[PDB]
Design a binder for this molecule. Sequence first.
Ligand code: SF8
Ligand code: FE
Length: 291
Amino acid sequence: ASTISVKDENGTVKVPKDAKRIVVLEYSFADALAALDVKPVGIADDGKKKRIIKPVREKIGDYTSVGTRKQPNLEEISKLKPDLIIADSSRHKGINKELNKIAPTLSLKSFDGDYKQNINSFKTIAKALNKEKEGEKRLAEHDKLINKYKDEIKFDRNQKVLPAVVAKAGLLAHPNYSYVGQFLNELGFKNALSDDVTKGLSKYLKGPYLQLDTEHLADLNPERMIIMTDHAKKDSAEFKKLQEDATWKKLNAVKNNRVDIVDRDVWARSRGLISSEEMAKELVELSKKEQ
Ligand SMILES: O=C(O)C[C@@](O)(CC(=O)NCCC[C@@H](NC(=O)C[C@@](O)(CC(=O)O)C(=O)O)C(=O)O)C(=O)O
Ligand SMILES: [Fe+3]
């Protein structure tokens, strides 16, 4: 019974050459398999089918939920009798021993990976499935599309951008080395959170993100903000108090109509080829709206 050796975040994994039925524990891995014409048999979808971005969700069709990404249901994983499990190298360290009793398990970056690392995980998945050629073709198409959208995005790249989610009193900002920050850099944007800026705000770190109160937002005063919220809504209680705040109203991005509220599932959680294409496409559209 022969195998393909690949490297994951824990070292070598021997993936059976007959691996066809695969459980995935992050959204990006579901996107990877859909791109390769493989339908996962189980997905940790948080009990929320709509968190799987629509084109991916529609290509995959029916699957079995294995619960939350934080705490996947190992009983449900075991019941599926998968050939292979694809787990997140940050979220799933604690369950790794248990997963490997169920099936060969790949531990790959998603949750703590940037844009290029999530691309690296896709390549590892393609190799593991004996679909290296198909993966190369798909990535060439992806890169061509991203570059086409880059060229179609009309925004002035000298307007520095702050990507963030809403938290506490202020914003929880994604710095320049995050998934979203790096993807914005790939599209030619300049992150307002430069290395020096982030260094001078580091006492505000909460894990990899920076907690910015309105005082610190005012000091940074980015020309442009991209605010990722559930359902791309702007009327949540947290966001409301922020939007009604006096320092908020004086911000350059606010005064000049350069704050865009975008979908958190697509922009922050998906981390796939389709979702990044959609994020770039959305920036094109936003840039072409009446000035
Ligand atoms: O989930 C992702 O893949 C990406 C990302 O974590 C990126 C991000 O910016 N996170 C900031 C979260 C701050 C927010 N917390 C939550 O909502 C919890 C959680 O994040 C948990 C999870 O993921 O285990 C959740 O999704 O339910 C709070 O307490 O204010 C995200 O959720 O956007
Ligand atoms: Fe999250």
